[PDB]
Ligand binder design. Sequence first.
Ligand SMILES: C[C@@H]1CN(C(=O)Cn2ncc(-c3cc(F)c(OCc4nnc(SC5CCCCC5)n4-c4cccnc4)cc3F)n2)C[C@H](C)O1
Ligand SMILES: C[C@@H]1CN(C(=O)Cn2ncc(-c3cc(F)c(OCc4nnc(SC5CCCCC5)n4-c4cccnc4)cc3F)n2)C[C@H](C)O1
Ligand SMILES: Nc1ncnc2c1ncn2[C@@H]1O[C@H](COP(=O)(O)OP(=O)(O)O)[C@@H](O)[C@H]1O
Ligand SMILES: Nc1ncnc2c1ncn2[C@@H]1O[C@H](COP(=O)(O)OP(=O)(O)O)[C@@H](O)[C@H]1O
Ligand SMILES: Nc1ncnc2c1ncn2[C@@H]1O[C@H](COP(=O)(O)OP(=O)(O)O)[C@@H](O)[C@H]1O
Lengths: 746, 498
Amino acid sequence: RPNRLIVDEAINEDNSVVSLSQPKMDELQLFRGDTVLLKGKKRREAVCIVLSDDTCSDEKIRMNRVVRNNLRVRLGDVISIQPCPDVKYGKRIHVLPIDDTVEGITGNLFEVYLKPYFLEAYRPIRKGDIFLVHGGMRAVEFKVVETDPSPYCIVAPDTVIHCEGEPIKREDEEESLNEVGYDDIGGCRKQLAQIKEMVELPLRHPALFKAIGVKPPRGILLYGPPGTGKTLIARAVANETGAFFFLINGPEIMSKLAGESESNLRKAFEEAEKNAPAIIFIDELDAIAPKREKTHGEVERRIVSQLLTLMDGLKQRAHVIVMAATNRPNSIDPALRRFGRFDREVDIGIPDATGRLEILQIHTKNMKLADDVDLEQVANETHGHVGADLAALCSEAALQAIRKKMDLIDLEDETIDAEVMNSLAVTMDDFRWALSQSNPSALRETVVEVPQVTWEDIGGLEDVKRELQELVQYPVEHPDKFLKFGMTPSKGVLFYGPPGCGKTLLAKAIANECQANFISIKGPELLTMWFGESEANVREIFDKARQAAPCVLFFDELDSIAKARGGNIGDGGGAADRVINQILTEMDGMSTKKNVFIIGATNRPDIIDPAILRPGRLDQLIYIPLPDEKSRVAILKANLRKSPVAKDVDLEFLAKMTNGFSGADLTEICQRACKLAIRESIESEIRRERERQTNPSEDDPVPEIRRDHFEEAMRFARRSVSDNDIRKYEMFAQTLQQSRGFGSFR
Amino acid sequence: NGPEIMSKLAGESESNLRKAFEEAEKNAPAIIFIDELDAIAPKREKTHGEVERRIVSQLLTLMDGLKQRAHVIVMAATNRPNSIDPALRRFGRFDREVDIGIPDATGRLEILQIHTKNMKLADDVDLEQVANETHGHVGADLAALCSEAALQAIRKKMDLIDLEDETIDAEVMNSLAVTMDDFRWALSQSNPSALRETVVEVPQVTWEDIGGLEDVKRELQELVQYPVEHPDKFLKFGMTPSKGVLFYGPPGCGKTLLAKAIANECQANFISIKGPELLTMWFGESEANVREIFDKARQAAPCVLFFDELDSIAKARGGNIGDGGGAADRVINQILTEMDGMSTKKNVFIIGATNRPDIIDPAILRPGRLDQLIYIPLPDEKSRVAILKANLRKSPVAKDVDLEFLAKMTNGFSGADLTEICQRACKLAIRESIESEIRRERERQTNPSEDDPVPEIRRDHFEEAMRFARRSVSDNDIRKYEMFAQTLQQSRGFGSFR
Ligand SMILES: C[C@@H]1CN(C(=O)Cn2ncc(-c3cc(F)c(OCc4nnc(SC5CCCCC5)n4-c4cccnc4)cc3F)n2)C[C@H](C)O1
Ligand SMILES: C[C@@H]1CN(C(=O)Cn2ncc(-c3cc(F)c(OCc4nnc(SC5CCCCC5)n4-c4cccnc4)cc3F)n2)C[C@H](C)O1
Ligand SMILES: Nc1ncnc2c1ncn2[C@@H]1O[C@H](COP(=O)(O)OP(=O)(O)O)[C@@H](O)[C@H]1O
Ligand SMILES: Nc1ncnc2c1ncn2[C@@H]1O[C@H](COP(=O)(O)OP(=O)(O)O)[C@@H](O)[C@H]1O
Ligand SMILES: Nc1ncnc2c1ncn2[C@@H]1O[C@H](COP(=O)(O)OP(=O)(O)O)[C@@H](O)[C@H]1O
């Protein structure tokens, strides 16, 4: 029945598009772009435009917040559709801006923020419709008051659109619920989806939770580095679901009189309870409830008990949800970590490489960014920047664009608003500055991310690409077989081989394949823990992996702790040590987590204590050898990929001449070749500038890495592994290997 | 519950607690339960002042102020009461301190059964795989997993549940039928609350699982089951039963398995403090934590406190030679000191395990302490056959394989590496099965559009696994154990004159 469908989040938006599935649109009687005539809840309909994408699943209908708020529909609701593929034009379309969105910007809004949207964008034009256009550095929205066709009309230059007048006030009877929502959350889509599936039912469906019986999460402990969006995601999941959001940020209450602040918190909870669907969000819970024994006295504990008696005092039949924001909740009171008060503790974490792109896209919506800017180089370069840093970079670029145009902006008495605001056009040249003049907030936190190094990048090693794909992808794709033969899947793999041979690359590729997070604790971090007499910090790292999705917790450069103290011989102590022992102890806990696939990497395995390479722990040894001829050819081609290269070079000859070079030093050879090529190119460029400046007053002296550049780089090459070192790895492999081919009798 | 009172005005919270006790007393059979007693009465010297101690004294004067003729019982809840005020640990106030502990493997099954009563669980779900997989989950985690599975079942049926104005209650609630596919998700999306606490449990590895070693199955059944079944004889001949046994032998030869089987036989708790835990205590300069572990065994029922991989502390610092220090160290010395206290507990049967005994300080292997040495040798021919059959049990196996030939070819492989051979065979068999399954899927997808290419671990899989086998003990290492055994052994058969 195509009449009714359940709404869902849209990704294409365009301020107008409603996304269906063609195998479903055929039932909906729409093919390419036919009008939808979307039917709302109370007393309104929208024309909308039909389109499709991947996430439809032939089950759900997707609408951006413009349509959802226009139709008085919250995400997760059920709505109706009245398909009508017909074309009808209007002549008296009149629109007025919304004072809530225009309260200090004055100009020709019919021309400054309207021209690029009233044609070819297919606005949901219909009397009473409200639409956002996202103009000059502000999410300006308008309402079309009169549309003489209805409920559908052609959005085309044939239809006549008239000029507006003075701004009108927003309808306080409904408030339009603009605020924020899911569409302006980026870089934490998985965490936002987890929160949605965790909190949507109790807030949208409080009626069933009085009958269904099963207790939903009374409180959700959002946490992450400051400025990660905890407040933003909380407010989005509040407004998007229609739940009343009560912010009781810690300092606002801790600053009040002792005893009176307790009353303030209690009456905040009472305010949340008086209306069923409300949610109360406790920002900066570290201040409110830090470690109990680390508090001084009076308020710092008077609140905590007062909080606890209210945190679990609620019966959960009032439909009140207590979300909280903290930083690595190891700091908050352990008493709050109990169940019935905070039973779910999603980790937002810093945005990853491709999440910062989305954050920039959403924040750089109204800036009217120039065409030469890409926002993908900026996202990649902003490594460690938290979403707050991305917003700060956005604002800094905007301010510099204003400040590089203050000469022609202050012509009249300072700013007159006016169309001039569109001229800014923040080019890359301003982003570069903002990025270089902003300090990452969270640069010293283990970043959980899905690495974007695919199987193709790691050429050469092939038996290990299939001997490693097995352990990871077989017990997930067909777990039924593994529970039949009785074997427990091996949640442990350590790569031992010559230094710099793709261990990190192989682990990252494994993470990439099964869309899995990749937490690399490099050797220097383990040395920091060992030297610092803080091996307990290891407990956090493993926990950081546990709270995440399927995670290849990768101990890069393992055995560095032992390598830093001679090893099994040459030192008074034995093989075991602080950090390795703590890793061993905590690993056995994550031997039953069935999502984490602990990986190790070692450049010198024989010093590793054998206590870890036994069943349950990193039992499965894998040997990656130094690349062979064909493998070296593959590595050369793969690591020179994404860089210009001439047809003259034949990588087969280089590979065979590359007799005994590992992956790291082979990529070093490629980097030296590229370095010499860029030096030649820049020298030719400055020489061409010299010619330009002199009397005479062919533009590509070296448009790719030339062959003799590779010649010179190879002449400048260097190898890091000797015959004895490479033989040592195979000799060690003989320890857990055998040549018992004699027992051929089955 | 503590916070409900600690949140009230100082002096007025004292009155609230006092009137709570008065309410308990006004009716004789009432009992008062103090939840989160850590907040109410933490360590006295670690409190700051005012309420945190004003309550405690106010509690103490009421905890023992009751005459016990009013029939009021004051139960309390705490976490490892080493944290609560020691003054409350005195007698006449808290004289019995039972330890609930986390549910064991078979207890989580019952917890799931009771919590999954009203969910109307589907038929394909078993609740025993879920219980086994939920290792470390506390009962609260089991309830959370229950609720998460229920919520996912609702959420995978919200499409046909919100047909009317949201939920109309109605019969539809029976349709949920939370299948395993939802439990799997809930289990994978829940973090164990208590995963770093020594778990007291009755292990479910019976005598049958540990094949081969037989003289030790009867030389170990003796010390454990004779002084409990017929204690009258032991108090007649005068000998005190030996509450100590250390297993020394090649690494990975069933020491942990033998200790677990001993625990299983006499329905006894089994606290294994593996070598890495003792190294954590030694490195951390926190040998006092050992005092807790022994206490954790004392408060439990008959308990084989098992020091798995003992001597790891000495193995981590060279040993008796190669290091400036002597045989003794922090953790081993603390274990020795605390063990003498539990030499008169007559329920605990401290067990040790060592892969390299000669480095162990001999201070522990003398009367009262782990005096009785037991040698488990590397398995022999028949013993290797038994081990093969026992560790391939509970897994499909073909009739083609004849384990006698594998065992004899398995000339010098220990128990651990022999089970490793079996695991490699099963790994290759599962790889072959999954490869055949994906190939069959390929055939299904292509034009043509016999369902058991490999329904058991086949024989050539064992062939290849044995070709991929590996041994962890050499001739010198195995001879070292018997040479050490000669230290406390003799060949004095000359004195045949009675
Ligand atoms: C008592 C015991 C058990 N026993 C049994 O008879 C029952 N039994 N037989 C098999 C299983 C089983 C266990 C699992 F833990 C499991 O996990 C799947 C999984 N899900 N997500 C990931 S993440 C993966 C890697 C990183 C992120 C990207 C993708 N993995 C994953 C991947 C790789 C390795 N390990 C887990 C699946 C299973 F089938 N239980 C008897 C035996 C003698 O002893
Ligand atoms: C002064 C002294 C004594 N003396 C005497 O003449 C008097 N005397 N003679 C014998 C005993 C005696 C002592 C015990 F401690 C005891 O304990 C029984 C027990 N109960 N539960 C378990 S747990 C068991 C193991 C783990 C959990 C699963 C089941 N065990 C147990 C098991 C194995 C080993 N040890 C205890 C029984 C006794 F008979 N007293 C003179 C002498 C020279 O010196
Ligand atoms: N994931 C995100 N998506 C979009 N904006 C974000 C995100 N995280 C942070 N921000 C930006 O950082 C600012 C602070 O947001 P938030 O972290 O929710 O509050 P707080 O910094 O007080 O915790 C907001 O103005 C918001 O625009
Ligand atoms: N196909 C490949 N095989 C091996 N190494 C590669 C390949 N492609 C690139 N590399 C280079 O190998 C390096 C990874 O080194 P890695 O082996 O992780 O060091 P370690 O062995 O110390 O962990 C990267 O710097 C990368 O440039
Ligand atoms: N009958 C048996 N005898 C010996 N070992 C067995 C037997 N059955 C299984 N095993 C294997 O022995 C291993 C136990 O090793 P264990 O001897 O406890 O190591 P350690 O000697 O270091 O304590 C288990 O992993 C198990 O798979």
